């Protein structure tokens, strides 16, 4: 598939019809639609060339034409066009300027009376653009717009049961985009009733007479049910004008009722696009549900009285218990209640949709200012350039791409983390469910999620269910719904035609399962083929005449979950944790492709975008550690420049190194330089370690891990961490801050490394507390104490009148100094207002694995490192090879992630190599093994795809034949367990031990970032109780639960000490410090400062609180 790839042999018994799609398409295709690029134009024309209109073109078309109140003149917009980006991607990321392109739109002003047209490009602003990797660059930072899951606008029918009567009562909710809700609810009393804009109910006949229906017409249409006749009888409203009067008196009370503002009231509320835009998706959903305008294209999303009438008729028919209705002039549709969580009702607002909505808000604001100024515009003196104000639009875009919750800080711990930050569907944000208001029924898994959203990959905190990951093969409908591919099986004959069905269409079809054996004639080789049906119920099957079949296994899993071998042997909890923990692995220095992996490793690495791929075929002309120049087949040559030791958003390393020689011919799309967590182009998040699964001396107790010292000697679990420190000399009242090596009062030792110009030199090792940037801000005249003046005279110095505010290596940090980036106003570099210089120093440290660091496999088998043993007191096989890691056997059986053990066994086999003895045919357990897997050379990488893989029998067999290491000696019996020698005692352990090779990752929860301590430091502003956080010098919160625990202990003195002198009392604090430093007794504690703050707050609430002495 990919031109140059490692030959990872697979245990897969099923061929895949569809190749995995362009995993990043979710973002790039949506943005291309928004822009209206030629690529999107062609893609849409292939599939609906009737009306290809981009997002910006759509916004402009909806906005234009505009006219004033009189309509003497009008303005219009057309032909949006983008100029070339301002600066290249890397330079934009470097100098902190947004990666954007100018946007030009041709305006047109027509004075309807005089008859003049004036057109000119208007420069709507600097539109941020999406990098080819599917991500935005804003203020130098890397950001991702995550798709949002929202309730699709339309008509939703619900039914409930009332306790007071135990009767099934139905309801409808026409949910628009920025409209007014109309909930035709049916109460226990047999009378339908409207509730306009959530206002005190109505009889529906009142609205119908407000729409101008006659009671004869009302019984002509909604006459079949008794509920309707009952409503007409008990309504008591006689006349159209009576209904309109009552409706106006109820909707907008306090103003004098009329006839004009009674009619145009409703007409504007519902049937004018000014206030009730349903949007294209909303109108399409209403039409499909009610079967009104199925044939016609979509336009004028606003409603019609026909729609409301059909909604009422549908609700009443549903209450009666009908099955289908045929609206006059409309195709018949089935009467049934709607499910809000069904993926036929949850639509995706992709990046394009969100950006378009923000453009729409900005354009509405610009439209309003245009209209407001138009009154004060001198006729014939105005042109669109001087009539259009772009500031609201650019302001809206800028406030979206920054501080909008769906514009998230790109998560780059590794290529997989970035890839899965894309393809992420979050059910919360602007116009979406909030964690608090989100119920418990939206977080669950729905049958419609199969193939459209991963049921496994999901946050495990207070976000489970609200955030998910798009499946591998899932695609987004032009309308925002999520489609999934299926093989059309015709007359029991499976085919290759891949139809992309949304959830609704899937429900109407009896869809089969991927692993249904096929007779090789296209037809099912058995009756009783497993299937799913409309209600989401998996049950028995009608043999033959199944309309669709799954494209392939793993259709339901996402990219992260598709990289867990033996997923089917792991409980959903452990699989979920493994998926969420693959994204936390730090990039190691080396990276090794797993012995046991899947088919998703290579594609994930390629599509993540952090691995260099040749654009076009050619012969590598010259390769070096910093760039690769390749000569193409026709004259031209191209140079790819690697990104060496760059810092990612999360502090990790982003090193890229070539993997091609100086003469190799490379085809288009071939990997030519692996990325951070990549090995020969395939993803590599961790290392393969020789593992024993025994309990060892209580050091691997409760999910703790004991590692050999080899892993620290050979430096296999080690990560480069780059940390950036920023400091900017500003303009202050007393003057300006200088960056130089003249820091006041500090000696010539700690001013040693600092360059001639201040900032420290490159390659200068710095430990916590050292000076990076020597800065000196002015102090202004103050009052030196008599003691200090005397001391200065004795030691002959001067006040210097300038304080120090130097940048220093914050506490607990260390490392070399990669490079310094200096921006300066004097050299005319863009900097914020009132700053002269801004210097950033990059400090890199090579972290080695040490106890407290968090490790994990791919099966949710996490754990911190309890101990790092010397290699000599490490269990070693009979051969003499020490084991690298020791997990505990007490964590496997009950957490139900036996898959890891399977992986272990397979890993060992892959490490040793095997030969199935096919002397007399193939063994019965190897009959269905793919050819060429009968023989594997030692250290052979293998793949076990997610839900088709190495069956247990095949693993048993391959474990039996495990061709010997170096002499004739099989270190692992057929059971998979090896006889280990004790490192310390020297005797063999009495029983064999499960030994193998587990691929374990080093998670980004390193103890160096977790350790923190405090004795005294900053104190908060309004209250004492020092600042919290390791970032500051933070004290550990002693909450109310801890204080209750202390009260239960009966320890009154320690609790008083904690809550008074350790935290708040501002006089006993320095006193306790003095007592400790001088050896005196700790003093009596006083009144905490927070209590007096409370007393003042209460008094300022006009509450006379006084502390009576007695």
């Amino acid at each position: 598939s990919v031109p140059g790839a490692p030959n990872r042999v697979s245990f897969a018994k099923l061929r895949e019809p569809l190749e995995v799609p362009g995993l990043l398409d979710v973002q790039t295709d949506s943005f291309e639609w928004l822009i209206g690029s030629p690529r999107w134009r062609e893609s849409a024309a292939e599939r609906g060339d009737v009306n290809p209109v981009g997002g910006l073109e759509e916004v402009l078309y909806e906005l234009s034409p505009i006219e004033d109140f009189s309509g003497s003149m009008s303005l219009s917009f057309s032909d949006p066009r983008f100029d070339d980006v301002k600066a290249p991607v890397d330079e934009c990321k470097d100098k902190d300027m947004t990666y954007a392109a100018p946007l030009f739109v041709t305006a047109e002003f027509i004075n309807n009376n005089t008859g003049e047209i004036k057109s000119q490009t208007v420069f709507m602003g600097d539109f941020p653009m999406m990098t080819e990797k599917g991500t935005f660059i804003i203020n130098g930072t890397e950001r991702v717009v995550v798709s949002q899951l929202v309730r699709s606008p339309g008509v939703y029918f619900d039914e409930t049961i009332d306790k007071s009567t135990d009767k099934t009562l139905h309801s409808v909710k026409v949910i628009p985009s920025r409209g007014a809700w109309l909930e035709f609810d049916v109460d226990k009393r047999d009378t339908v009733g409207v509730r306009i804009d959530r206002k005190r109910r109505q009889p529906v006949t009142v609205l119908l007479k407000a729409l101008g229906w006659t009671s004869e017409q009302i019984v002509e249409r909604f006459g079949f049910s008794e509920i309707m006749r009952s409503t007409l009888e008990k309504d008591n409203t006689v006349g159209t004008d009576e209904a309109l009067l009552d409706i106006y008196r109820k909707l907008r009370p306090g103003e004098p009722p009329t006839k004009e503002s009674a009619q145009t009231l409703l007409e504007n509320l519902f049937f004018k696009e000014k206030r009730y835009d349903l949007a294209r998706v909303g109108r399409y959903k209403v039409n499909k549900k009610l079967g009104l305008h199925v044939g016609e294209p979509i336009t004028s999303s606003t409603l019609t009285e026909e729609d409301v009438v059909a909604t009422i008729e549908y609700l009443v028919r549903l209450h009666e218990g009908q099955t289908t209705m045929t609206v006059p002039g409309g195709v018949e549709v089935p009467v049934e209640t709607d499910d809000i969580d069904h993926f036929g009702n949850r639509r995706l607002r992709t990046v394009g949709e969100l950006i378009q909505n923000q453009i729409r808000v900005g354009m509405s604001r610009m439209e309003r200012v245009v209209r407001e100024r138009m009154t004060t515009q001198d006729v014939e003196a105005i042109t669109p350039q001087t009539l259009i104000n772009i500031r609201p639009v650019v302001a809206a875009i800028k406030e979206f791409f920054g501080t909008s919750q769906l514009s998230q800080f790109m998560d780059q711990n590794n290529p997989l983390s970035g890839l899965t930050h894309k393809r992420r569907l979050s059910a919360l944000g602007p116009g979406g469910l909030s964690r608090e208001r989100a119920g418990l029924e939206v977080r669950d898994v729905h049958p419609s999620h199969y193939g459209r959203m991963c049921p496994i990959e999901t946050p495990e905190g207070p976000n489970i269910g609200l955030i998910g990951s798009l499946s591998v093969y899932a695609r987004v409908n032009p309308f925002g719904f999520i489609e999934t591919p299926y093989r059309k099986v015709v007359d029991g004959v499976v085919s290759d035609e891949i139809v992309y069905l949304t959830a609704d269409e899937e429900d109407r079809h009896v869809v089969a399962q991927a692993n249904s054996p096929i007779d090789a004639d296209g037809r099912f080789v058995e009756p009783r083929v497993l299937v799913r049906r409309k209600a989401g119920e998996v049950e028995y099957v009608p043999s033959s005449e199944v309309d669709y079949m799954d494209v392939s296994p793993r259709q339901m899993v996402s990219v992260a979950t598709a990289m867990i071998p033996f997923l089917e042997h792991d409980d959903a909890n452990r699989a979920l944790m493994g998926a969420n923990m693959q994204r936390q692995a730090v990039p190691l220095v080396r990276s090794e492709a797993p012995l046991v992996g899947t088919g998703m490793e290579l594609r994930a690495a390629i599509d993540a975008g952090d691995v260099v791929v040749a654009e076009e075929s050619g012969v590598i002309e010259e390769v070096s550690a910093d760039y690769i120049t390749v000569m193409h087949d026709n004259g031209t040559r191209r140079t790819y420049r690697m990104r060496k030791f760059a810092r990612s958003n999360h502090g990790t390393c982003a090193n890229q190194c070539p993997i091609v020689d100086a003469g190799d011919r490379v085809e288009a799309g071939q990997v030519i330089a692996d990325g951070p967590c990549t090995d020969d182009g395939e993803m590599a998040l961790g290392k393969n370690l020789l593992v024993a699964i025994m309990p060892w001396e209580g050091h691997n107790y409760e999910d703790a891990i004991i590692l050999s010292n080899r892993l620290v000697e050979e430096d296999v679990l080690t990560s480069i961490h780059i940390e950036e420190h920023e400091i900017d000399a500003r303009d202050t009242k007393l003057g300006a801050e200088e960056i130089t090596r003249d820091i006041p009062n500090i000696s010539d030792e700690v001013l040693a490394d600092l360059d001639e110009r201040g900032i420290v030199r490159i390659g200068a090792e710095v430990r916590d507390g050292d000076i990076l940037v020597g800065k000196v801000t002015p102090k202004g005249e103050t009052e030196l104490t008599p003691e200090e003046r005397l001391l200065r005279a004795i030691f002959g110095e001067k006040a210097r009148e300038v304080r120090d505010t130097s940048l220093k290596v914050p506490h607990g940090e260390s490392g070399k100094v990669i490079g310094i980036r200096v921006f300066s106003r004097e050299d005319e570099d863009e900097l914020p207002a009132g700053v002269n210089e801004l210097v950033r120093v990059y400090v890199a440290q090579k972290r080695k694995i040490s106890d407290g660091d968090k490790l994990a496999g791919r099966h949710g088998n996490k754990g911190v490192i309890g101990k790092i043993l010397p290699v000599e007191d490490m269990p070693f096989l009979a051969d003499g090879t020490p084991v690298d890691i020791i997990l505990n056997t007490h964590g496997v059986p009950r957490r139900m992630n036996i898959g890891q053990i399977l992986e272990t066994h397979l890993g060992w086999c892959a490490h040793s190599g095997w030969k199935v003895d096919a002397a007399k045919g193939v063994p019965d357990w190897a009959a269905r093994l793919p050819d060429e897997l009968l023989e594997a050379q030692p250290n052979a990488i293998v793949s076990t795809p997610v839900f088709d893989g190495a069956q247990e029998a095949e693993l048993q067999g391959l474990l039996s034949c495990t061709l010997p290491n170096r002499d004739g000696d099989v270190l692992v019996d057929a059971d998979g367990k090896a006889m280990l020698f004790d490192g310390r005692s020297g005797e063999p352990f009495p029983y064999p031990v499960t030994v193998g090779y587990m691929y374990i990752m080093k998670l980004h929860h390193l103890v160096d970032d977790k350790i923190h301590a405090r004795s005294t430091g900053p104190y908060s502003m309004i209250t004492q109780q020092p600042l919290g956080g390791k970032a500051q010098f933070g004290g550990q919160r002693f909450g109310e639960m801890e204080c209750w625990a202390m009260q239960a202990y009966g320890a009154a003195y320690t609790l008083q000490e904690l809550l008074t002198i350790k935290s708040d009392d501002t006089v006993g604090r320095v006193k306790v410090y003095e007592a400790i430093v001088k050896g005196e007794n700790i003093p009596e504690p006083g009144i905490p400062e927070s209590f007096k703050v409370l007393l003042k707050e209460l008094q300022s609430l006009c509450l006379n609180v006084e502390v009576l002495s007695s």
């Binding site: 056997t889 009950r894 139900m896 048993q956």
Partner: protein, 99 residues
């Protein structure tokens, strides 16, 4: 994977209880009982099936196996997890709550 033994009578038990499930499905297809009653009957059938396969697994295991040794020494875990690991996981809950 060699320390996790499946029960050798599993397929016979599955056949014996799928026969009853098929009988219930026939009965439903002839209008004998409504959807809820058929669902309850099938739930009962498969609950009994899970119980029986669990008993077979329990009686098949040696008393020396690390799995059963850990479970039955009070160290950790219950036998339901062992049955889930080898044998039949049993019925599963609907998202609403039902079986």
């Amino acid at each position: 994977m060699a320390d996790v033994l499946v029960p050798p009578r599993k397929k016979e038990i599955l056949d014996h209880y799928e026969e009853r499930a098929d009988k219930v499905e026939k009965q439903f297809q002839r209008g004998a009982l409504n959807h809820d009653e058929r669902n309850e009957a099938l739930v009962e059938i498969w609950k009994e099936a899970t119980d029986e396969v669990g008993q077979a697994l329990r009686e098949h295991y040696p008393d020396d196996n690390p799995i059963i040794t850990i479970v039955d020494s009070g160290a950790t875990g219950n036998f339901t997890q062992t049955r889930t690991l080898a044998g039949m996981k049993g019925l599963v809950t609907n998202p609403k709550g039902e079986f």
